Amino acid sequence: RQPYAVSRKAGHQTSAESWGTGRAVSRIPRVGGGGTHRAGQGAFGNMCRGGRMFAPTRIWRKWHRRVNVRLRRVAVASALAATAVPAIVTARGHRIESVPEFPLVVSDSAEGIEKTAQAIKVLKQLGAYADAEKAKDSVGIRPGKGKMRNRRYINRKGPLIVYGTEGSKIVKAFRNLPGVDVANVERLNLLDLAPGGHLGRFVIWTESAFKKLDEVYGSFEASSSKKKGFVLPRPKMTNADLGRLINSDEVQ
Amino acid sequence: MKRNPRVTSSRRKCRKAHFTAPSSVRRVLMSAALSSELRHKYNVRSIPIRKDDEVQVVRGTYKGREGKVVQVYRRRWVIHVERITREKVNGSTVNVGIHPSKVIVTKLKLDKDRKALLDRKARGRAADKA
RNA sequence: CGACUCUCGGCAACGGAUAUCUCGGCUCUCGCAUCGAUGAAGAACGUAGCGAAAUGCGAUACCUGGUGUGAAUUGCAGAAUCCCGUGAACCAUCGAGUCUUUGAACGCAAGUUGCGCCCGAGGCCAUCCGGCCGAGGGCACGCCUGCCUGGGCGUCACGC
RNA sequence: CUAUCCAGCGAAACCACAGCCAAGGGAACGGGCUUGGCGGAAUCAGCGGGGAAAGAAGACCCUGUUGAGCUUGACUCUAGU
RNA sequence: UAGGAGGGCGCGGCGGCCGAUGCAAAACCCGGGGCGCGAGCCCGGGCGGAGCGGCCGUCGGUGCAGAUCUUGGUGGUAGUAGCAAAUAUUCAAAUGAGAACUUUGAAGGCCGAAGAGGAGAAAGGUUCCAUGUGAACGGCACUUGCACAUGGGUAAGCCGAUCCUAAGGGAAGGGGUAACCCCGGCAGAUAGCGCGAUCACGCGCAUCCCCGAAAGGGAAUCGGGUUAAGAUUUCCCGAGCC
RNA sequence: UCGUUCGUCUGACUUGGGUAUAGGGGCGAAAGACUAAUCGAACCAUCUAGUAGCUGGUUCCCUCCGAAGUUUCCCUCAGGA
RNA sequence: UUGAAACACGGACCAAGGAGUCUGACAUGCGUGCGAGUCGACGGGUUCUGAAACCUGGGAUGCGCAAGGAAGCUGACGAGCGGGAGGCCCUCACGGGCCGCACCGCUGGCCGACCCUGAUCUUCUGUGAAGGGUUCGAGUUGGAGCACGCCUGUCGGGACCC
RNA sequence: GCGCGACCCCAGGUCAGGCGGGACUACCGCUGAGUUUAAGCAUAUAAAUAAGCGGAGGAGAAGAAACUUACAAGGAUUCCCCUAGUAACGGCGAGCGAACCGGGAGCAGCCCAGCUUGAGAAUCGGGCGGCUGUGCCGUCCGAAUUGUAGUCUGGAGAGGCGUCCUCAGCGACGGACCGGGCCCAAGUCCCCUGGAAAGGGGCGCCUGGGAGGGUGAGAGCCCCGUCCGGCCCGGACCCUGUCGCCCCACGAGGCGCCGUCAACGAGUCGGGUUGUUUGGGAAUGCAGCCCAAAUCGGGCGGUAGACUCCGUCCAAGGCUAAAUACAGGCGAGAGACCGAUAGCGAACAAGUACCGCGAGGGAAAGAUGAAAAGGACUUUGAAAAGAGAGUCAAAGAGUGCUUGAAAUUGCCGGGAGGGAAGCGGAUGGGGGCCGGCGAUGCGCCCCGGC
Ligand SMILES: [Mg+2]
Ligand SMILES: [Mg+2]
Ligand SMILES: [Mg+2]
Ligand SMILES: [Mg+2]
Ligand SMILES: [Mg+2]
Ligand SMILES: [Mg+2]
Ligand SMILES: [Mg+2]
Ligand SMILES: [Mg+2]
Ligand SMILES: [Mg+2]
Ligand SMILES: [Mg+2]
Ligand SMILES: [Mg+2]
Ligand SMILES: [Mg+2]
Ligand SMILES: [Mg+2]
Ligand SMILES: [Mg+2]
Ligand SMILES: [Mg+2]
Ligand SMILES: [Mg+2]
Ligand SMILES: [Mg+2]
Ligand SMILES: [Mg+2]
Ligand SMILES: [Mg+2]
Ligand SMILES: [Mg+2]
Ligand SMILES: [Mg+2]
Ligand SMILES: [Mg+2]
Ligand SMILES: [Mg+2]
Ligand SMILES: [Mg+2]
Ligand SMILES: [Mg+2]
Ligand SMILES: [Mg+2]
Ligand SMILES: [Mg+2]
Ligand SMILES: [Mg+2]
Ligand SMILES: [Mg+2]
Ligand SMILES: [Mg+2]
Ligand SMILES: [Mg+2]
Ligand SMILES: [Mg+2]
Ligand SMILES: [Mg+2]
Ligand SMILES: [Mg+2]
Ligand SMILES: [Mg+2]
Ligand SMILES: [Mg+2]
Ligand SMILES: [Mg+2]
Ligand SMILES: [Mg+2]
Ligand SMILES: [Mg+2]
Ligand SMILES: [Mg+2]
Ligand SMILES: [Mg+2]
Ligand SMILES: [Mg+2]
Ligand SMILES: [Mg+2]
Ligand SMILES: [Mg+2]
Ligand SMILES: [Mg+2]
Ligand SMILES: [Mg+2]
Ligand SMILES: [Mg+2]
Ligand SMILES: [Mg+2]
Ligand SMILES: [Mg+2]
Ligand SMILES: [Mg+2]
Ligand SMILES: [Mg+2]
Ligand SMILES: [Mg+2]
Ligand SMILES: [Mg+2]
Ligand SMILES: [Mg+2]
Ligand SMILES: [Mg+2]
Ligand SMILES: [Mg+2]
Ligand SMILES: [Mg+2]
Ligand SMILES: [Mg+2]
Ligand SMILES: [Mg+2]
Ligand SMILES: [Mg+2]
Ligand SMILES: [Mg+2]
Ligand SMILES: [Mg+2]
Ligand SMILES: [Mg+2]
Ligand SMILES: [Mg+2]
Ligand SMILES: [Mg+2]
Ligand SMILES: [Mg+2]
Ligand SMILES: [Mg+2]
Ligand SMILES: [Mg+2]
Ligand SMILES: [Mg+2]
């Protein structure tokens, strides 16, 4: 975010002064002088026309908030897992109905592609082009004030392409496509993996990138990640199947 | 998406630039498209419109009306074409306004400068496709 | 049945809320370093075929010149040679120019277009081979380096 | 000469809602409440009983750890001498 | 009641999802139908003519009846209070759409000259004069005007300013001052040197620069004509003066 | 401000223009008078949104719980712990 | 306000605007992450819609991990009891027994300020076997903390508005 | 009846030059409050702040220890984090409040004065002339010996000796950075609606380009642009990349030894006292006055004092990038900001109109339509206007014109009323409105076909 604030001097560029009592008018400061309609009018008050606002906004508001380095990594881990669950990728709105398998890993030959047309064929050979269809079809003008605040068009989210090898070209084949995002494997972002705060981004992994995941995040073992001071989080419940536990022989 | 961090993507500035452009800049903005026959012949898509060109309206209520350019009235972002008129209430005749992006230039007013300008634009469109 | 008052509805007024906008504002970030005695910032008066303001300009006065572009400016009128070219334009841009009266403001002043002095290209006669009206241009203050002119037994030398 | 009536022109103060009384009770003097008296469209000119009428965040008095002008044997300083 | 908490409703953005709309979006209007204890919500009809809504998360300049609240608009009061100083108007005619209010003539009155007359200084700035004029304005009215529009109009050797000094002001060197600024007699090769000379030199230098009066001091003009509007003395005629 | 009536009118008289004195300063035949409708300290801007234990106001719904005017100390008694 | 329909004040009407906010410190509660640790908050690297994101350092930066003394200084030698949720053993079972978390109560040991004490050793002024105390500590005999986020409260700030 | 030379002063419209004033964001110097807080108030705080007076630059200021520390010590300046709300200061109250260490950003050090040309001012300015011209050369005047140049700056240095080791410039082409001009993908194909297609349906295409804007309604393909880059023109540059010629020295420097020398800033330091300032406490800096130094000497080691030792540095002259700051200027780019009573006072001929003698004060006011197509003509009227008509998708969108709320007002229709009206519960009468306002289907069956 960028800060916003009113002018520090706004509403305070008059020599206005209270008439006091005894003149059958309220005690608000008033513009003195004469010869214009401004004379005798109220000033400086948040109720007055032309006054300053109550508690004027300042640029030393707390715009940026800090999150622990470890809590950031934990949340990325949870987001990645949910990308591998078809029910959650469905529920978050992605059309995944002709995709062969989740996780969706495509060969490294995709890496070298060049054109938006080339990228379109790749999405067709997967079951991915339908989700990209919805993103492009959903583009319209943003209702409200944002359409005049340089945010004129909005759309849906498509799939997210993750590549592994730095310096590739699929960055440039996919960027014209609305909804479609590209990421490098080492530096994934929570804002892409769970956009809107909702779990289940549709991810197309390259074979180059899917094999680096174990390098990047490691396992339930100390000092296995590429990250330092990090170990994958363990759940409070080893198997979440209430069906299996409640209807096991031991409990019944 | 833009790459040059010196061109503005702001609605406010881009509009100001358009509506406060000088005359030498409105010549480019008030540009028209070549006809299918001329695009085929000169390998250029669109050109800045000229005094003595010949056009054909392709969008207005006057769609399918051909005529000669008689005035490129840049101050109103408009061109008047010969016989593209209506009559006032008193019976006088006035020329109606056409924006250059709603006509096709069916015939070119060719000069030394226009021939060189067609060359430069033609050298370009081929310099990428080839 | 009526008048008046109150009230409900429809229509018409009054007024400018609401909605939808926006060449404006506000905030953050970035780059750069450029006023003046070679007369600045500011003030005044002028200036267009038709203009008062704003914008622009300075008696070359909404401009001159060069360069780029390449056919308009436009509210009306007119020249339009300005159209395969030294070439339109309330065009862009900048090297050549112009730049009234003032203002630190500088010959003295100032509720004054007041009051001096100096130079002087150009022209007239002869009261000289000088004098008369001159176009233009000087004459503030403090200071530095040099210079010219000069002063004082301040210290000397040499004399008379 | 006004006021008055006519043609033309044409404000402002004020305004919770209003506007007939008697007694009672009530923040101990009601236009509204309680109980009685009553009570009939719409208008004109006056009048100063009432609206505890208008005007003005009582100037009297008190309070405030609010002032200011002035004085001095108040406290703390200071120009001058 | 004061006070505390929970669960909701509503407004505007941001990240996401799901959608409406030129076969009519938002806003607004209604004696239209309903839902909810309620905040509110849904639909109908109309008007309008291009945008809008619901859900999850999140965020905020987020909900009005008051504050002698702020700004704007609007009533009753009310066709009411009121239009009453300076003696005063009347008759015909012209004009005009329209005359108590303009114009001409006649009559009756007033100012009564320390004037309601004729001219100026200050201050104003075109109000001056002609022609025309829809609105507004001239607290009734108007053909009218000190209004509006378009034009025109201010002529100097002799009137002034300009020159001189008054009270007084500013001021160079110097004194003070952190500096802006403050001090003029303090006396400094005081600013300026003046005069005779040029064909060069001589003399003298005393209380000393500037500003300051359209009523003080002061080179010089009178009479007769002339304009829609300039002049008694600025223009014309004549006659003079410095 | 107006009407009538009054005071003075050769003087310490009336008056124009010029000039001098500027804010804890001026000027005062003295009334705290006057210093541009402002005077027991002018006016303008800023410090400044000065401080207020004091007055006024403080914006949606439902559901649930629900007081105190008493103790001690305080230049404390309209306040606070 | 003890008390308002008040002969208490404000309110003619309508529209729009109009008042507990932002920030810093602290505290309790709650949520998240890690845990004797925990923060990457000044930087660096990298990042092609991102001033974003992502990586890196810390072997000692902050807070915590140890306290008592004004200071010089010294610095925790290892806990029992009563009641206890819950588990287990016994009984036909009612009843009994065993172990007993948190928490409440009770009595102690140890560290330190102050007092008291003194075998041995020793560099003669130090050490400290033993033995202590109606004294004092925000101590120890339970490692629980650190970071972020939100409400509320106190305070500083124009500080709910005039 | 002299003429001298120098000293100190003159006056010059002398030759040539440089000074003053303007702007306020950030920077340097001075001067300097009170409101306020302490629940009063005076020291204190507000504050070494506002106002006042000056001076600069693109940054400024500071800067190379007369520094810290007490350690195995470090090593110019500035800025960030930490130290730290700490030591301290304080009616020890309210409150206030740094630095060292450590970690980062950025790093760079220099030059004078003095004993030291004396066979010799070797230095410098100006006029004039010339040329290769930001300078060099010749010459004539002058400054300066009361001292210009060269050496030298404590880390040193002068000397002496010594195998040794080190040194001169201009070309040529460029690379980078800087400004500018141009060129660059794809549908306006078919039907419908519409005033307008940029909307819907069909069929296609571009995409390293689906940022943005314009065009008669949501346009990637209509236009400008955007991506990838291509081209042509002009600069400043003093940075380095390579080819060419020129070859650096007996001068200076480095390095090895030597011990003889070894110069180092004065009304200044330092002390007293006064006032101010500071966290600085027997006194942190600064300033007035008084006293007033030293050269086995001087300044420090955060409690005043004397002595012994120890650590440490060398003031009184000067220059010095970078890292930092930046409500002004100019040129940009953005935004979870405002949407005409909001946002700057000003979206508009806004610091305008207007007010005040003045210093100063200071508004209101945006939106026809896609296009003026801005309403010819007839008729009534003195006119303004009206009634017909005309334009438009529309004027009932008619030049303060998108929408067009409320208060308040007029007309038409309806309803009720004995000194208020409105209101809450009941219901009765009128209205007005409600067809998901209210059903006609399901099971046995008999055909007659699907
Ligand atoms: Mg009143
Ligand atoms: Mg404002
Ligand atoms: Mg009448
Ligand atoms: Mg009674
Ligand atoms: Mg009453
Ligand atoms: Mg009764
Ligand atoms: Mg009656
Ligand atoms: Mg009456
Ligand atoms: Mg009465
Ligand atoms: Mg009253
Ligand atoms: Mg009172
Ligand atoms: Mg008290
Ligand atoms: Mg007092
Ligand atoms: Mg005393
Ligand atoms: Mg907001
Ligand atoms: Mg608010
Ligand atoms: Mg209201
Ligand atoms: Mg209320
Ligand atoms: Mg009347
Ligand atoms: Mg009267
Ligand atoms: Mg007389
Ligand atoms: Mg006249
Ligand atoms: Mg009238
Ligand atoms: Mg004079
Ligand atoms: Mg005179
Ligand atoms: Mg005179
Ligand atoms: Mg004559
Ligand atoms: Mg009287
Ligand atoms: Mg008399
Ligand atoms: Mg008399
Ligand atoms: Mg007088
Ligand atoms: Mg006088
Ligand atoms: Mg008295
Ligand atoms: Mg306040
Ligand atoms: Mg009270
Ligand atoms: Mg009472
Ligand atoms: Mg009463
Ligand atoms: Mg009261
Ligand atoms: Mg009232
Ligand atoms: Mg509101
Ligand atoms: Mg740590
Ligand atoms: Mg126990
Ligand atoms: Mg215990
Ligand atoms: Mg607060
Ligand atoms: Mg001082
Ligand atoms: Mg303050
Ligand atoms: Mg106080
Ligand atoms: Mg107080
Ligand atoms: Mg006080
Ligand atoms: Mg200041
Ligand atoms: Mg410097
Ligand atoms: Mg700490
Ligand atoms: Mg302080
Ligand atoms: Mg194109
Ligand atoms: Mg189409
Ligand atoms: Mg568009
Ligand atoms: Mg293009
Ligand atoms: Mg001191
Ligand atoms: Mg320096
Ligand atoms: Mg505004
Ligand atoms: Mg305003
Ligand atoms: Mg319509
Ligand atoms: Mg309309
Ligand atoms: Mg529209
Ligand atoms: Mg309208
Ligand atoms: Mg209404
Ligand atoms: Mg009726
Ligand atoms: Mg009823
Ligand atoms: Mg009923």
Side-chain angles (χ1 to χ4, degrees):
Chain A
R1 280 210 287 175
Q2 290 190 201
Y4 70 77
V6 298
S7 167
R8 321 259 291 259
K9 229 72 177 182
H12 278 263
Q13 312 190 61
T14 53
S15 58
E17 182 65 26
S18 183
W19 278 6
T21 188
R23 309 186 61 169
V25 297
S26 67
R27 303 183 292 201
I28 196 69
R30 289 184 197 274
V31 177
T36 174
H37 284 198
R38 186 90 188 95
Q41 293 195 348
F44 302 143
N46 59 304
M47 73 291 291
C48 294
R49 168 198 196 271
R52 83 292 182 276
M53 65 179 288
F54 166 69
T57 55
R58 301 302 188 216
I59 60 180
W60 59 87
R61 186 195 305 258
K62 292 181 181 179
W63 308 96
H64 315 285
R65 316 304 271 261
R66 210 178 82 255
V67 184
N68 300 13
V69 173
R70 189 145 186 173
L71 186 45
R72 266 179 278 158
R73 280 142 170 207
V74 163
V76 169
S78 290
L80 281 185
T83 69
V85 183
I88 299 178
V89 179
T90 299
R92 185 264 180 274
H94 300 266
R95 320 289 191 81
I96 62 170
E97 182 65 26
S98 64
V99 166
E101 178 160 20
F102 268 84
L104 182 54
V105 189
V106 65
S107 60
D108 283 344
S109 65
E111 182 179 1
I113 73 153
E114 178 80 2
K115 319 270 294 173
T116 298
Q118 267 183 314
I120 287 169
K121 278 73 176 175
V122 163
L123 308 163
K124 287 173 175 174
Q125 276 147 30
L126 302 176
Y129 171 79
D131 206 25
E133 169 182 16
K134 177 203 64 172
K136 179 175 182 187
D137 191 359
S138 68
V139 180
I141 300 176
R142 177 194 295 266
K145 294 188 287 184
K147 70 174 85 74
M148 44 196 282
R149 305 270 177 92
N150 298 341
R151 306 184 292 265
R152 204 163 178 89
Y153 291 87
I154 56 181
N155 53 283
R156 294 288 82 83
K157 302 302 301 179
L160 165 70
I161 315 305
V162 179
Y163 72 91
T165 62
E166 183 178 1
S168 284
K169 297 182 290 295
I170 62 170
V171 189
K172 297 173 179 80
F174 283 114
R175 56 166 63 149
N176 296 114
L177 295 179
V180 171
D181 290 74
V182 188
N184 177 299
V185 69
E186 290 83 4
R187 54 171 175 267
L188 296 173
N189 187 350
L190 189 69
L191 302 186
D192 301 340
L193 289 165
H198 300 129
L199 290 166
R201 182 70 181 264
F202 180 25
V203 187
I204 294 160
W205 297 92
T206 316
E207 167 198 355
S208 64
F210 196 71
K211 298 170 54 61
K212 295 181 189 182
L213 274 176
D214 264 348
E215 182 65 26
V216 180
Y217 299 111
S219 60
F220 292 135
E221 182 65 26
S223 179
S224 66
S225 296
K226 209 165 186 160
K227 307 184 179 225
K228 192 162 177 181
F230 174 74
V231 165
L232 290 186
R234 286 162 141 101
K236 282 179 183 169
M237 189 186 208
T238 299
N239 189 179
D241 213 327
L242 294 175
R244 184 180 64 83
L245 310 171
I246 291 177
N247 295 321
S248 66
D249 187 32
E250 295 82 339
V251 290
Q252 293 285 326
Chain B
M1 176 75 60
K2 65 182 289 293
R3 296 291 184 269
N4 190 23
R6 278 194 65 230
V7 64
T8 187
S9 179
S10 66
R11 178 176 178 77
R12 176 183 182 175
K13 282 175 181 168
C14 296
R15 271 169 64 87
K16 192 169 168 47
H18 180 277
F19 291 121
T20 55
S23 190
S24 47
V25 173
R26 301 195 179 197
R27 199 188 61 95
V28 194
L29 304 181
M30 302 174 48
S31 182
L34 278 297
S35 67
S36 194
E37 182 65 26
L38 294 174
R39 185 199 294 180
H40 181 74
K41 153 181 187 181
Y42 283 112
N43 183 26
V44 289
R45 189 185 279 280
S46 66
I47 199 174
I49 191 166
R50 178 66 181 270
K51 181 67 180 294
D52 190 359
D53 289 334
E54 182 89 344
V55 306
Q56 167 176 327
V57 191
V58 295
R59 283 281 181 280
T61 179
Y62 300 99
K63 181 169 176 63
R65 297 275 296 267
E66 184 178 1
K68 190 183 59 63
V69 186
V70 297
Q71 192 150 240
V72 178
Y73 185 78
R74 299 183 187 174
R75 184 176 177 87
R76 300 182 174 176
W77 306 98
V78 66
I79 52 166
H80 307 290
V81 175
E82 189 191 42
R83 280 75 178 272
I84 313 315
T85 47
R86 64 181 293 164
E87 69 275 16
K88 287 191 56 176
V89 179
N90 55 17
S92 300
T93 300
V94 287
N95 264 290
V96 300
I98 302 299
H99 194 284
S101 72
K102 306 288 162 279
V103 309
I104 75 181
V105 181
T106 54
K107 175 168 288 189
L108 268 191
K109 169 54 173 213
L110 298 170
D111 209 38
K112 181 174 71 68
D113 278 346
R114 297 292 299 275
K115 290 165 188 173
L117 174 152
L118 288 167
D119 169 70
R120 283 178 271 139
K121 292 176 71 68
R123 281 155 44 203
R125 291 177 55 85
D128 287 312
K129 291 177 70 67

